[PDB]
Design a protein around this nucleic acid. Structure first.
Ligand SMILES: [Mg+2]
Ligand SMILES: [Mg+2]
Ligand SMILES: [Zn+2]
Ligand SMILES: [Zn+2]
Lengths: 589, 589
DNA sequence: TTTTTTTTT
């Protein structure tokens, strides 16, 4: 009756964007440039342009989608005839569907229609190949005939061989020819519901999703995704009877998105403020009163330094923080916020974690009895932040397992005939209590901390928190009561904007040390060593690691302002913050 | 369409190398002399000669390799008819394909094409036999007929039996005839992607490869390889249905490289410089300031001594080094460099290693239920170097398991009805911290080291590193900042050249001890022992092993300069380095 | 059962 082929073509070439630039024309041209084969379409734009087409897509997806894909191919084909013989067909993916269903609310009425699901990826299988059009040869001394079996039909997910030879009308034995068989990429992944959606008491549930063609390897485990596609039932051996007419549910993904130009200008405008550093610092844990030096230190760990990769060695660029404090000083509240604003973070505790779970585990799969590696907490946090609450409660024989990952940023395993090395480039933030629960001033600093000097040298900054009831109790009491009353602080960057800001900085900014910063850093390091040698009593050691901590911190300060060079101003701040760190552990500079 | 037989023969006989020596002519003669049945052709040579031929090999590989193989066979057979009846057919292997694809980015479009993958070898199976042309016998009271079942076609990967007897056109049951069956060698290996190309937060992937004919047993596990061949889908159980329309992929290897005259010329001229020893020492860990004695000791372990094999016993020729130091003294950075410059090295840590994993593991195969052995780190490092970081962090019950491999260089297993003895000729490099993290000067050496005297006696050299701040801080700070600023030290042999130099020295050099060096070593050992008896409380003991250490070190010094005899000078250097080791551990000389 | 890495009484 009505053809949407023209409307779809009209929509793509005639659609004014936010800045009136025909964004979809630009997207198509970018697709031809690198042969992307996949085009992303916003549902809202289709609804804004022509509503009638929008309902057709969301309600008749299984029919109208192949029609649009063919129409798009011709339009691209006209733009570039050379697009052939490298790409044979394209894919149209739709995002922004309003039909969002919780993973626990799926019922029979939701099967067969395009829906959207939000969850967490937990398992990804290696990419494999699926046959969708096989080629067979009849093994019968008369035939020697080659044919494609699923004629006029895509081969189903259950393989089936012909029973009668089409070219001779005889039964017999058929042989598959891999050379003439058509294949498509295939990957299986498992999604899990968010903890915020799990009801009280029960464990989270899981759903199986299938990724095909270019959708494979689109995300890594631990990511938060929004999948869109068609639900369907799952079968393994339909021929194998014995009742059991009960089937599971699997999700046939058509478009996946993880976690725009408008953000860049929004981010770029933020960096133009001269007081951007102070605004960022004041935006860390707005619900916590005071602890200005601690808030500043946590900001540095989020940005980090510049890792240096050389032809012979590599230098760690991550910043590690240690906090020791009396109970009730909001150590854990701050760590919770960090795991929320960090683009990638893993939260663990000292008691609830083991040496094998922190780095890597060797397990025997019951399917084959063969040992294989399992990623640990530090490995999964690669490129992110690892948070280790209650570090003092962790067994010492287990805590030593992270010494290598803290400095060399690798995990080495030699167990059960498996020798492997895994990257663990993650920043470690840890908190804990002193030896006797509360800090005791009479005893020396050495026995209060109760940690080996080997692990203390691996932390760039160490802060000791003391809860002394003084004149600020009234200020603290009023601040807390305001939080419980719903009153909040304004003129602070929200979490979502801040998370976008940090991710941009860690990807496009790489400061360089200038000569002016070199002299200041060198002079202060020499001063450190002389002071430390004078008093060989403090439990901390001024090793060459402390010199590199100055370099890492200096780059982080420059990175927070999206600067390209480490000026003298950043060097002074880096020296200043470590002066406070040294004062905390009782070293007077 | 033009015949390429003449062009291929023309290229073989008329190609001029760097010296215009007709290199491939020499290769054919070597092939004829040794009956090697395999030819290696560099792709870039073919492209330079005839670009049209090079393209055809890349693209039309399925139906052009047998054509060239036949043409080459006739040329060889014409050259020497005696080559026939010894070699039925020859193989042409092409090396240097421009099409290189990472293991993780293989898609359906790459199946059926000649591609190159570079990875790490992991597992190798014993050589087996594959039937490529069967010979059955229709046993039926009237038939008694035998025949080659797959007619005018190679036997497929799937074992299939005839249904109708060709000699009588009747059904029945058939019996295989092993005597008349044709077989071909067959080996299965597993390759793994390199650690430097694994994406962040993910475990490495694996690919299955198949080696046939002379390609079997071309490499050992742990080797870095570059394989070239055709990808294909893998079929395991296609007789029974049940979906499973998803297939894995494997590789049909055509040519394999592991890890020349020009290099040997480069190495030879390097040793001509009288100061070659100092150049090599200065080239060890260029990013680390100072530690000249440590750098020199590490160079010796790279080269090693001369193992002696006698009719009654054998004496090890490897050098073991132990480093004890305060945290932050860059012990791990040097060990990382050693694992990268050595021709063969295995890197492990104290905490991430087990007694079974270091030497050998007994694992029960689930398929058959019988135990079998798996090679540990020391076995895999045979003929190379084993690096054990954080030696003091492993449990003493596990550390004691390497006493035999450290001296006798063998691993003995009496477990689960398996009695075996494996060679573990590997040099051990170890590092660790003192008992209290940092070295305590007031306490003696016995309580600082915290290791049993048995394992200490097995180490040729022991160096204690102390981090004392002093006047060298300013130069140390400047050196580190220059490294971070990108400045590089010149007059340094690069890693690749240095690795080639070490491999050549360990292979073609075997120094002999002269009389002059004999007298010097004897006098020092006697004088060393006499002073040892004066203070018997030291944890170190001057056993007869230390006499062997002097011999091994002296040979290593001679081997560093590609000398053939241990002159007087090399004995002097060996004594001096021993004095530093003794003086460092607290024994004056 | 017997050897192995792992969390658990
Ligand atoms: Mg807490
Ligand atoms: Mg170390
Ligand atoms: Zn037929
Ligand atoms: Zn017959």
């Amino acid at each position: 009756q009505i053809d949407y082929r023209d409307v779809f073509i009209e929509f793509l070439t005639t659609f004014k964007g936010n800045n009136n630039q025909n964004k979809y024309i630009e997207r198509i041209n970018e697709l031809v440039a690198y042969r992307k084969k996949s085009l992303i379409i916003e549902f809202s734009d289709v609804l804004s342009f022509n509503e009638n087409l929008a309902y057709e897509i969301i309600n008749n997806t299984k029919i109208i989608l192949p029609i649009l894909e063919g129409a798009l191919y011709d339009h691209i084909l006209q733009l570039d005839p050379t697009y052939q013989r490298d790409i044979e067909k394209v894919h149209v993916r739709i995002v922004g569907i309003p039909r969002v269903i919780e993973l626990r609310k799926i019922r029979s009425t939701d099967i067969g229609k395009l829906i959207t699901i939000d969850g967490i990826l937990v398992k990804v299988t290696p990419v494999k190949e699926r046959i969708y059009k096989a080629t067979y040869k009849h093994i019968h001394p008369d035939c020697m005939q080659e044919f494609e079996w699923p004629e006029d039909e895509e081969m189903p997910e259950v393989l089936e061989m012909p029973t009668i030879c089409p070219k001779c009308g005889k039964p017999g034995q058929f042989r598959l020819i891999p050379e003439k068989t058509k294949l498509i990429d295939w990957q299986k992944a498992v999604i899990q519901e968010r903890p915020e959606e799990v009801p009280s008491g029960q464990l989270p549930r899981q759903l199986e999703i299938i990724l095909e063609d270019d959708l494979v390897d689109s995300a890594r485990p631990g990511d938060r995704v929004k999948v869109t596609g068609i639900l369907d039932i799952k079968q393994d051996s339909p021929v194998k009877r014995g009742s059991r007419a009960v089937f599971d549910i699997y999700m046939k993904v058509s478009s996946i998105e993880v976690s725009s130009e408008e953000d860049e200008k929004k981010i770029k405008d933020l960096a133009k403020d001269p007081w951007i550093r102070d605004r960022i610092i004041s935006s860390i844990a707005p619900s916590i009163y005071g602890h200005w030096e601690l808030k500043e230190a946590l900001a540095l760990a989020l940005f980090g330094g510049v890792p240096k990769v050389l032809e012979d060695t590599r230098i760690r660029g991550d910043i590690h923080i240690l906090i020791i404090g009396d109970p009730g000083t909001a150590k854990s509240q701050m760590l919770q916020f960090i795991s929320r604003v960090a683009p990638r973070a893993v939260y663990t505790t000292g008691k609830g974690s083991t040496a094998a779970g922190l780095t890597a585990a060797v397990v025997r799969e019951k399917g084959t009895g063969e040992y294989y590696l399992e990623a640990g907490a530090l490995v999964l946090a690669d490129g992110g932040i690892a948070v280790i609450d209650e570090i003092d409660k962790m067994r010492d024989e287990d805590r030593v397992a992270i010494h290598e990952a803290m400095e060399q940023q690798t995990v080495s395993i030699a167990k059960a005939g498996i020798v492997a090395k895994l990257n663990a480039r993650a920043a470690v933030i840890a908190a804990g209590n002193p030896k006797f629960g509360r800090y005791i001033s009479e005893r020396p600093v050495s026995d209060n901390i109760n940690l080996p000097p080997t692990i203390l040298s691996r932390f760039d900054l160490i802060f000791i928190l003391k809860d002394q009831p003084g004149e600020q109790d009234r200020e603290l009491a009023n601040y807390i009561l305001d939080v419980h009353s719903g009153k909040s602080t304004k003129n602070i960057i929200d979490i979502d904007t801040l998370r976008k800001y940090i991710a941009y900085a860690r990807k496009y900014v790489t400061p360089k040390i200038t000569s002016e910063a070199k002299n200041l850093i060198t002079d202060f390091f020499v001063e450190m060593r002389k002071k430390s040698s004078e008093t060989p009593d403090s439990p901390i050691l001024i090793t060459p690691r402390q010199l590199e901590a100055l370099i890492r911190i200096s780059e982080a300060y420059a990175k927070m302002a999206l600067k390209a060079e480490v000026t003298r101003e950043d060097a002074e701040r880096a020296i200043n913050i470590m002066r406070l760190f040294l004062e905390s552990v009782g070293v007077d500079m």
